[PDB]
Symmetry: C2
Subunit: 628 residues, 2 copies
């Protein structure tokens, strides 16, 4: 064990094992997760070359292989608890995305919930045995956010009892779905239903796209990979062109609407909830690497003539990393709250849940995205190498800001609810849940204590209240000038997103503050409080104008915030390594030479470089062409 890390770990103020409990939910959930991890770690079937040293085609092959095996083995070992399945899948895939995701997570569950009895007979068993591999193809080249615009048509032919699936334009081509390009032989296609001469809007169809057995594309089907991306090498994100491709009527999904033989027509909250946990996890892994590597790495001088200190001893380095560590803990507790909530709520709740999951999904993904690159830059030159693990964490996390609801569209869904809540309060109705603070708007003498999580929650609530009011009044002003709700909404969209942001920030502070009161271990409660206070005071320091305006705080109080943040850095220094240990990520999960639990970076890094692909021969073949 690196003696620096041994020292940091030995004089930690708490037991990180008990904090691990708190993150998993119980001492037994810790134990069971570790058991699932160790059964995978020791299974030769889940082993392969360092992914950094493979080409894209090889990464795709390794990932498919693992995903096939993972289904077999989970079934073999009777792993059925949804938490156990997540722990198993995460650990198998070393945090990479896994290419059977849409088959196990959409195609199968959609048949098991919506199949007719005949569909059930044709599909359940083959879909279960991966003889049929399916995805979900909705988005098109021309259409991602705005699904009403989709151009794919499913035209009923009553002469033959078949639906004609067509891609009439280049923009209509199905584009992005995982497993679509190479992995899947079936797709549920989303299409504009045309029956008689009438369009009935978007319906879902089971469309075989490849021959079972040979995997050769079916006649009228053009299918492939959309090309390489910033990350997701492991995922055959695909395109699907259909040239008037015929399916049986019996292939329409008819639980909710039906087409009779004569052509007579009869009439993402889970994923966004989960993504809040993923943001927590991705930022926690980044902070683990950067904080360990900053305790291993020595560089530069403070005191002249004294040894080069650990770069974690520089205040600029503590300021880069301890605010992010505090955020990561904040997002851990938010994640767990969203999961508990989503589980319970599963109807005066649907709208608050949709607004909350949308807003926190945007807020936590955008924050974690920025924090991962900050962690990488904090590692200096060796951060930029794949030896850090941070580039791969970043490129496989960052699409979360874009897919599963574009974050600006998500914030605007949160804003719709905040406006509707604001209007309900101004029309004499009571509002409940995370918007209850709107009931007490002065429109429908208070001093902040910067060592009290409750008083900081209050500050963040008033910042949100003020920005909600500013959005609502700017929206009203644009409606009376421009006499169009939609135009007014567009021209207030920046204020609306600011209000959602400040609202979500307040929710994160409030939830971290309330979690402090449930911590039984006193030493853990004290170090978590330091982090809660650092989170809260950092966000004030970073958004000082939002607290100075409406007299929520004074200039002298911002000076005291800044003074206290500096002191909290100095407090969190002795606990920083122990705090990232408590996440309990294994070396293989971090994929980091810099971040390794034992802190033996330098000897491992020289080996890693020597094993890397360009060192397979001493002389590259490009030498014997270079001039002489």
């Amino acid at each position: 064990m690196n003696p620096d890390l041994r020292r940091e770990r030995d004089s930690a103020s708490f037991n990180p094992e008990l904090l691990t409990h708190i993150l998993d939910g119980s001492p037994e959930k810790t134990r069971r997760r570790r058991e699932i991890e160790n059964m995978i770690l020791n299974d030769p079937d889940f082993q392969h070359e360092d992914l950094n040293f493979l080409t894209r085609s090889q990464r795709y092959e390794v990932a498919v292989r693992k995903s096939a095996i993972m289904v077999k083995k989970m079934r073999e070992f009777g792993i059925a608890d949804p938490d156990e399945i997540m722990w198993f899948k995460n650990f198998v895939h070393r945090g990479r995305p896994e290419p059977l995701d849409l088959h196990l997570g959409m195609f199968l569950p959609t048949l098991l919930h919506q199949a007719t009895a005949e569909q059930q007979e044709r599909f359940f068993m083959p879909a279960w045995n991966l003889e049929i591999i399916g995805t979900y193809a909705q988005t098109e080249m021309g259409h991602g956010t705005h699904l009403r615009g989709l151009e794919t048509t499913a035209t009923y032919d009553p002469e033959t009892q078949e639906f004609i699936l067509n891609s009439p334009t280049v923009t209509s081509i199905k584009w992005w779905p995982g497993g679509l390009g190479k992995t899947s032989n079936h797709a549920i296609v989303l299409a504009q239903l045309i029956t008689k001469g009438k369009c009935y809007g978007l319906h879902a169809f089971i469309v075989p796209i490849r021959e079972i057995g040979t995997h050769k594309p079916l006649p009228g089907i053009t299918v492939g990979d959309i090309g390489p991306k910033f990350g997701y090498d492991e995922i055959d994100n695909g395109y699907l062109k259909m040239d008037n491709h015929r399916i049986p009527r019996e292939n329409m999904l008819m639980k909710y609407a039906q087409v009779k033989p004569d052509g007579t027509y009869v009439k993402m909250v889970f994923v966004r909830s989960f993504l809040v946990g993923e943001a927590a996890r991705a930022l926690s892994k980044a902070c683990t690497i950067a904080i360990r590597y900053s305790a291993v790495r020595h560089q530069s001088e403070i005191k002249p003539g004294e040894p080069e200190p650990q770069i974690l001893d520089f205040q600029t380095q503590q300021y880069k990393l301890f605010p992010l560590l505090a955020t990561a803990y904040a997002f851990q507790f938010v994640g767990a709250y969203m999961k508990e909530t989503y589980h319970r709520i599963n109807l005066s709740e649907l709208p608050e849940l949709h607004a909350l999951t949308a807003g926190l999904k945007a807020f936590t993904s955008w924050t974690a995205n920025t924090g991962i690159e900050a962690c990488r830059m904090a590692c200096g030159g060796h951060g930029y190498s794949h030896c850090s693990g941070l580039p791969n964490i970043y490129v496989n996390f960052t699409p979360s800001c874009t897919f599963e609801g574009e974050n600006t569209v998500m914030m605007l869904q949160t804003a719709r609810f905040l406006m509707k809540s604001y209007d309900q309060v101004h029309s004499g109705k009571l509002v409940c849940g995370m918007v209850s603070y709107l009931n007490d708007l002065p429109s429908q003498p208070t001093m902040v204590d910067i060592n009290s999580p409750e008083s900081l929650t209050e500050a963040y609530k008033l910042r949100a209240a003020r920005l909600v009011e500013i959005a609502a009044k700017n929206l009203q002003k644009e409606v009376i000038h421009r006499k169009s709700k939609e135009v007014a909404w567009n021209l207030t969209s920046v204020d609306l997103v600011r209000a959602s942001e400040a609202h979500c920030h307040y929710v994160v502070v409030k939830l971290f503050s309330e979690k402090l009161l449930k911590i039984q271990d006193k030493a853990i409660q004290a170090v978590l409080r330091s982090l809660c206070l650092l989170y809260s005071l950092y966000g004030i320091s970073q958004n000082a104008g939002d607290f100075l305006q409406g007299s929520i705080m004074t200039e002298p109080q911002i000076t005291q915030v800044n003074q206290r943040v500096k002191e909290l850095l100095t407090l969190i220094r002795s606990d920083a390594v122990a705090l990232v240990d408590a996440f309990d990520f294994q070396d293989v999960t971090l994929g980091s030479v810099l971040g390794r639990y034992d802190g033996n970076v330098y000897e491992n890094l020289f080996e890693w470089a020597k094993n890397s692909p360009l060192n397979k021969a001493e002389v590259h073949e490009s030498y014997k062409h270079l001039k002489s």
Copy 2:
């Protein structure tokens, strides 16, 4: 041409041709740059497969071949002016870094400027003919920022008239230098000079590492590639371990110090200059791609019945991109000012120059770095695909915030200058140049006045400089140590440098307006300057509210005017990116192409990509029942 982008271009208020002349410095620069780029674009030797479709190995082989061809072609066309060689190198490499960088930019010049006549006789013409390829190996696995802690030693043997180069520890191993892994057969190595029994500090040594001809590593040399990185696939960033490796005493670089045959010992600012313009360019390309795509891409609805508009019609999309387009132009002009400045001083002001170069390099690279990712996310799903070209721009620009002076260390070097200036002022001396505002340690901001806005930034900087100086003084008293106090005021010190650099950029952009002769280009640059200065206040309101620089209602007016500038820029945005004059091959972007024909070209690009070389992937075998 995409009838959208036609309409945007026909509807512009200004001639982008004449803005290109302003960006290049003259019409004659524009004509000469375009002629050089035309010389390359016409040459099949510079063509190759899309780099996105190739492995790292193939990318390295393409880049090193193009660098060998580039040298021959520049010599054939008699290209020798440093600006033309820049124009030539940047076009060829299409953004990407090039593997002969340290050969051409360090090893060859060091031989011309510092080598003895017998060194030039051994090394110069072999080097000039690429029969010797050289690099510069200074950084070690253990040491990047603090070179005084390098472990590589060069011990003088008086008996055999040799230096013994040694890498005693795993941390001592040279680590990072481009061209060291596979391309170079020689390295200039920086080592701790030991002669007699005394260490005389860091000196530079010419070290053959591989056999000319076979390229086999020499006895006592372990050399290789450090492995794959976030970007820089084209560069063999390398390691070099020397096991008591012996070189002639005559291999030492002795222009400035000598070791006699008996062992007797006798007695970055430029690249930081350049990196400002490189930041301007990388942001300018990212804005070009995202603003054009946002004028081609229709999605969602404003009025419920009506066609999906262009996404650039959404205020949120304007807010993501126009403040970056303003930042791109701000940076173009800081870059040109830094270039003229570095030239005039480098032919008294060495203090101001070092501090200004460090600070603007850090401020522009950190800002451009954020801006490039913001452009990619603003393209939505297609932004994430390499079809956008934005990931490759980001991963190849981002190491500029880390290398060539880690940005935090650069800001602290600015802050040392600001503290020395503040102390001068307060011991009754007069300061000059970029810090002359500190001498002046009723006045309400006019938000339509670049001069009035410049004045608001000056006061924000002076407040944060003073806050850093006062906190540093209190900590010096409290800690009985200047070095501990410096460490514990380092966040305040970086904030002061940031605000000083921000002011300098606002100042230079504001001043550049008064030199614009074309009325219509002046008016649109003015809208960008104001958008830049007002966005900055809006994003740092607390820095203007404290010390009574601006009131709450003035912030409300700032925020209202930022929204109005977004609208006003909208009709000029495509022509404003077109004025950067980037060719399609330089953008490397399906989404950003000059003709706006994205969707057809996207579908071609995907079909031509590697996983589609076969209908069934080898991996289908695992997906049995």
